[PDB]
Design a protein around this ligand. Structure first.
Ligand SMILES: CCCCOc1ccc(OCCCN2CCOCC2)cc1
Ligand SMILES: CCCCOc1ccc(OCCCN2CCOCC2)cc1
Lengths: 157, 157
């Protein structure tokens, strides 16, 4: 465990819909540095399922182009923690959300990336303040923030 | 002007000697993102001159290799502000330093990069706290921090 902060009383159905990745931070620079870095992922829409699993729609820069991706995160016994299947066991945690404006999450596993999601392409200084407070507890070495023009573009260009 | 914060009473001869670039931040992601990004520069030594100009020794990743660079920053009427000659007029400002441990500086010109320099390859949390306070005033969108192993390597690898 590195991330311990979780949303109390999370109702996953209420995170459905569109989101923007306003800012991102990660434990290691290589996770976010280039446009093609592995965790440089731009979240577009969250689609929880009736059983309370979570489909995640996002964009990622791969092979010189902006690709659409669709991921499923399986629920656990903890409502704020989900699991993605891979060669390694990857954990997704919801740290905090008010449903209507911002959502903070982290993905982990020793290594870690977190984002501040917002509902609209605006610089929400209070959401970023809450993101930065949550990151105080974590060993981050790279932090990115994006402007409204980028959020409204493709793969944040 | 963007950066307004300057070291009161700066004695430039006292910044001489070795330094490490513990952390960096910039106004635009492309200034720092890849290892070959333009402002990804790792400061190794400062050499003020008898007339109070400033030679700067650093490393930069260029063309797949770590190159040694030597730059001169010319003094101005303001002791904390220096100027580098280029196709554009580039301004270097000393924001704060205690000479013995940390030094904060920014280079500017609309666009901007700042670093936290430290004397030894240790994570100085107080120096980073002071860096982050100074950056609160500035429109940064990328921030990097480096670990002791990287500081002791070549071009921070
Ligand atoms: C409540 C917020 C849930 C969103 O969490 C995630 C967002 C993006 C993720 O993407 C991880 C990287 C996706 N890979 C990119 C490269 O291709 C394979 C998928 C994972 C979880
Ligand atoms: C008091 C601290 C002074 C140090 O300030 C600077 C540090 C690094 C700098 O480097 C700027 C980029 C150098 N270029 C890299 C690419 O080749 C040409 C030089 C400039 C000022």
């Amino acid at each position: 465990i590195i991330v311990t902060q979780t949303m109390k009383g999370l109702d996953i159905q209420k995170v459905a819909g569109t989101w923007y990745s306003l800012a991102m931070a990660a434990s290691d620079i290589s996770l976010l540095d280039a446009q093609s870095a592995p965790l440089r992922v731009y979240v577009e829409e969250l689609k929880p399922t009736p059983e309370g699993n979570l489909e995640i729609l996002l964009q990622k820069w791969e092979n010189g182009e902006c690709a659409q991706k669709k991921i499923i995160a399986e629920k656990t016994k903890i409502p704020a923690v989900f699991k993605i299947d891979a060669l390694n066991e990857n954990k997704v945690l919801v740290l905090d959300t008010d449903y209507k404006k911002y959502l903070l999450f982290c993905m982990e596993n020793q290594s870690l990336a977190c984002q501040c999601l917002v509902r609209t392409p605006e610089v929400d200084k209070e959401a970023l303040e809450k993101f930065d407070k949550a990151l105080k507890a974590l060993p981050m070495h790279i932090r990115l923030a994006f402007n409204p023009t980028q959020l409204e573009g493709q793969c944040h260009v």
